[PDB]
């Protein structure tokens, strides 16, 4: 279940500053809670989690040509480790 | 005298601003009618500077704006007028400015001119 909870890492300027501060940003399944996120990270990466922050992103308006629709809604989790680190390369 | 499309107070403020700008920069670009009024305002200020007494200085301060001018020295517009400009025009009897037409502006067709100290 844990590898379903964690979808992908998020790579941005703000996420990179977070990684400099030992915070790792993941896109997670939109149904899971932050406790599940913490358990999944601990299990997958064999690290210790200090805290997990979470937020939702609404669908964003997007178009190509005459077709206007929306992107997928997102759930973003920021995981603060107390022990260890995660190698994304 | 011209009205320049402004009320009395607006016109007076704009003429003071233009005269002080001309004193600071020695050459400005504006509209023809504005320059044709600014020439009289600026020449009377220069006359006051050539007089150079305390009363003439205070009368000039009635009209000039309070703009600092920065060899790292610093002086006010009134100081420049009663110093450098007056000394340069000690021997000339009027006609301290000249207007040079340049042609219409793109945005509104206004006749642009350059008015400069001679």
């Amino acid at each position: 279940e844990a590898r379903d909870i964690l979808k992908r890492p998020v790579i941005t300027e703000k996420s990179s500053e977070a990684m400099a501060e030992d915070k790792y940003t993941f896109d997670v399944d939109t149904r899971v809670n932050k406790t599940q996120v913490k358990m999944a990270v601990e299990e997958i990466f064999n690290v210790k989690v200090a805290s997990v922050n979470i937020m939702n992103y609404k669908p964003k308006k997007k178009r190509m040509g005459r077709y206007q629709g929306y992107t997928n809604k997102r759930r973003k989790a920021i995981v603060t480790l107390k022990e260890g680190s995660i190698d994304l390369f | 005298y011209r009205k320049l499309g402004r009320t009395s107070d607006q016109r007076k403020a704009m003429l003071r601003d233009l005269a002080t700008s001309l004193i600071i920069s020695e050459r400005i670009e504006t509209t023809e009618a504005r320059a044709k009024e600014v020439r009289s305002v600026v020449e009377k200020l220069i006359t006051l500077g050539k007089k150079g007494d305390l009363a003439s200085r205070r009368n000039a301060a009635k009209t000039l704006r309070n703009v600092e001018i920065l060899d790292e020295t610093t002086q006010t517009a009134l100081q420049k007028l009663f110093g450098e400009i007056a000394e340069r025009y000690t021997e000339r009897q009027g006609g301290y400015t000249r207007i040079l037409k340049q042609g219409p502006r793109r945005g509104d067709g206004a006749e642009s001119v350059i008015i400069e100290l001679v």
């Binding site: - | 040079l100 037409k101 340049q102 042609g103 350059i114």
Partner: protein
């Protein structure tokens, strides 16, 4: 207040007889070999 009849092409063009612009007043500039408005500076 409103036109009683439509304006014919003939009448419209007759009215527009004087609706035109004029070539500007221009003179040759000696040094640069170009043109400018008379009594204006480059």
């Amino acid at each position: 207040a409103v036109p009683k009849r439509r304006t014919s092409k003939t009448r419209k063009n007759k009215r527009r007889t004087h609706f035109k612009i004029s070539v500007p007043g221009m003179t040759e500039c000696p040094n640069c070999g170009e043109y400018k408005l008379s009594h204006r500076v480059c």
